[PDB]
Design a protein around this ligand. Structure first.
Ligand SMILES: Cc1cc2nc3c(=O)[nH]c(=O)nc-3n(C[C@H](O)[C@H](O)[C@H](O)COP(=O)(O)OP(=O)(O)OC[C@H]3O[C@@H](n4cnc5c(N)ncnc54)[C@H](O)[C@@H]3O)c2cc1C
Ligand SMILES: Cc1cc2nc3c(=O)[nH]c(=O)nc-3n(C[C@H](O)[C@H](O)[C@H](O)COP(=O)(O)OP(=O)(O)OC[C@H]3O[C@@H](n4cnc5c(N)ncnc54)[C@H](O)[C@@H]3O)c2cc1C
Ligand SMILES: [Cl-]
Ligand SMILES: [Cl-]
Lengths: 429, 433
């Protein structure tokens, strides 16, 4: 007599994807979302590992019809020790996703996206495939009896019953907090400040005007600080700064600080000065964490609710989408067999490994800093580095690039006369 | 203490607009919507009387950013092939096979633009409903109101496997064609004359120039009438590439809706052939029993707006403007009633009187179209009447004083009806009861 077979907390990319998979499989599914869509949300530039999932669940047409800017590649700018391919020294690197064959991907492009629209399309698509979706409905607790009662809408409180809970709460980590298994990263503590601008000329930063719809990461000449530049429409562009919380606390105000930091680079500063900010400044903080358990009897965690690290590689949505995919296979087998913790270990193992790679790849980047440019551009490393940049880490093998980069960061770190020793970033793992 | 000052049943254009007005004004407001948005919905081509309301409530930017096709004008064509006596009328550039308009030909108060829009109602209603939330309203989707209990503040009885109650001082029924209170209170009256039936779908890749007078007019709404059968078909842009196409006919004819749709479209080769090159991107839906009125549209602690209060026939694309402007007028009364602490029926008579009148104009204007179509054509095209008739076609029927053109039409239809040897008597149309 439970209301649902599964209940999903949160309707972002993880939640919507999960529900859509579960409904196609024949389960009674509910999705609870405390907001009303469309709702603004950070995390806009996708990587091609999103696409197989979006195809599989049958939403690509609806995505294609939305008119999001296509993303053909990614670029880095800023302002040799045997490395080559460096046509522009360390002021520019570029890569195109099609340079490497990626399994499950048959296109040249993915998308940069207004998350408001993007999440709405996935959430309505979940409804079209059978899921019961409940907006402005906040889940307060999962009370663990033979099912779970979820306790939840305006002045009214209501309960619903499920055999299984799936936490897709993102950074609000509902069950992570409820069960007290959330662990903040002992090193990463970056802080993001961002906004949307209209009329920035994306040709400014572009070496070649065909590449101006790439994502641009702009390294700044401070410690562990950079900026993103992401197309949202022809005319609107999402810009954000990322730095250490300590820097932000070392200073005194969100706007003033954003511009101060951007002021470290004249060209971009002036370029942004030609634009009109179309949205208030929002901040993201305390977002690097993991969980000691990501599953238990009658629950599991997907998307940012299970982990998040740092958005330097634009992979968060692909992780949310692919964690949903993997978790579905386990939830479906558990439902059929009538048995909901150890039922979820395959999902756990495959996500632990996947996310270790992303993590370890990010730690290198920060130690490497600007030297990272060299690995994009040098052809011994370019294609391996691109595997990671594609979001492709759901494989047995340890990525070859991560080994090479780690080994090389070590040798540089230990040797104070190494040509690159002065260019090391200052955040370590 | 009640949960809300007002509670609104339905989140379409009437509901969303009402809520946004009420929140601006400082009331605690709730909107209940049984569906999840975006949801498909018929009724796509707007008239310029929508715009003042959309501006006033502060949602034009968000509409503008949606990229809806702009609507600069409309065309009403007729399959009439008999040689018809001009009977003194002029401007008949296309004889009696076509009449057309550009909304900017008349200055309309509150309107400063050249265009309105044709719209995906899915996206359009979402933007209004989220905008209402932005301005303060509490919105509850997939929440069905089953009854308004008035016998003890009203409790509204209502979400998945869960039933819940909420409290309000005042109920506003914006249920559209599901006429929640109209049915609950048994005050709904089907029209004794009208019951047309619509079949429609979306197509991708149609050349909109096919049906068009010329390819500059490709963006207009086109309605093609067969006056000897009270049957017509419409062509409404939805994107560059998607177009909404529909047929409207008498229910009795309808008593396999795909076959019928094509038969009716086949009456015009150009479009038929053009439609053959297109891809139907949505299933055929059918919209019926849509013409009705209500004996009461207000009472103690309730009132009805939009289609929940009345609907006639979509020939002039006015339904959304009526829903938006009824919301506007009803807000004034609801706001004054709230401030004075008095929601008795009589508090709402200004709204009632203005809407009775407004809607009587629309109604009588529609009857003429069906009953003597060539007359409709001649009045749109003739400069004695053109500008007054355009006022009505703009959706502007809330200032009151009877439009002069409508009176002249009525009087002329009478004379023709009574005289069987009047030159136009053989063109009078005929709707089955
Ligand atoms: C290109 C890119 C750039 C990115 N940049 C950044 C960045 O700059 N900063 C950053 O911090 N992250 C960033 N991310 C990561 C991203 O913003 C999210 O952390 C994550 O990737 C989204 O996955 P999700 O759907 O699981 O989370 P969400 O999309 O947040 O899913 C949670 C949703 O469920 C709802 N919800 C949450 N809790 C409850 C509850 N208790 N009851 C009911 N509903 C609830 C919320 O409305 C929320 O929208 C980025 C990701 C990408 C791909
Ligand atoms: C064939 C056809 C063509 C049309 N063409 C046009 C056109 O070209 N241009 C134009 O302007 N107009 C047109 N209309 C009219 C237009 O569709 C309606 O007038 C318009 O939708 C009215 O808005 P509303 O908010 O009053 O009702 P609706 O838009 O119908 O919204 C009412 C909402 O109430 C909700 N609801 C929530 N709770 C309940 C409950 N308990 N019971 C019932 N409902 C509930 C429903 O889900 C619905 O979303 C057309 C109508 C038809 C039939
Ligand atoms: Cl990320
Ligand atoms: Cl209408």
């Amino acid at each position: 007599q439970p209301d649902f077979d599964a209940a999903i907390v949160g309707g972002g990319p993880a939640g919507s994807a999960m529900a859509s998979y579960l409904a196609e499989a024949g389960l009674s599914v509910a999705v609870f979302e405390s907001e009303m869509f469309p709702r603004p949300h950070i995390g806009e530039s996708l990587v091609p590992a999103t696409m197989p999932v979006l195809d599989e669940i049958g939403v690509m047409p609806d995505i294609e019809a939305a008119g999001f800017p296509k993303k053909y590649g990614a670029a880095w700018t800023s302002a040799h020790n045997g490395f080559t391919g460096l046509d522009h020294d360390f002021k520019a690197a570029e890569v195109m996703f099609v340079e490497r064959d990626q399994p499950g991907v048959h296109r040249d492009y993915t998308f940069h996206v207004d998350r408001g629209k993007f999440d709405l399309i996935l959430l309505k698509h979940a409804e079209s495939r059978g899921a019961q979706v409940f907006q402005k409905t906040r889940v307060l607790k999962a009370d663990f009896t033979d099912p779970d009662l979820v306790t939840l809408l305006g002045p009214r409180t209501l309960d619903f019953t499920t055999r299984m809970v799936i936490d897709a709460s993102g950074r609000q980590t509902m069950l992570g907090n409820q069960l007290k298994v959330k662990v903040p990263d002992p090193v990463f503590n970056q802080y993001a400040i961002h906004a949307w601008f209209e009329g920035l000329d994306r040709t400014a930063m572009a070496l070649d005007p065909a590449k101006r719809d790439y994502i641009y990461v702009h390294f700044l000449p401070l410690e562990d600080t950079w900026m993103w530049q992401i197309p949202i429409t022809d005319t609107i562009t999402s810009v954000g700064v990322v730095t250490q919380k300590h820097r932000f606390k070392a200073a005194s105000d969100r706007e003033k600080f954003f511009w101060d930091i951007v002021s470290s680079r004249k060209d971009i500063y002036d370029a942004l000065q030609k634009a009109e900010r179309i949205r208030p400044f929002k901040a993201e903080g305390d977002y690097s964490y993991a969980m000691r358990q990501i599953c238990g009897d009658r629950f599991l965690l997907i998307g940012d609710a299970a982990r998040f690290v740092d958005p330097i590689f634009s992979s968060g949505v692909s992780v949310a989408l692919n964690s949903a995919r993997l978790a579905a296979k386990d939830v479906i087998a558990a439902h059929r067999a009538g048995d909901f913790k150890e039922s979820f270990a395959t999902y756990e193992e495959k996500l632990r490994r996947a996310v270790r790679n992303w993590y370890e790849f990010i730690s290198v980047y920060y130690r490497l800093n600007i030297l990272f440019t060299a690995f994009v551009q040098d052809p011994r490393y370019r294609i391996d580095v691109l595997k990671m940049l594609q979001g492709d880490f759901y494989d047995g093998e340890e990525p070859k690039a991560l080994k090479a980069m780690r080994d090389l960061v070590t040798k540089v770190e230990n040797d104070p006369e190494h040509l690159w020793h002065p260019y090391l970033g200052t955040l370590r793992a």
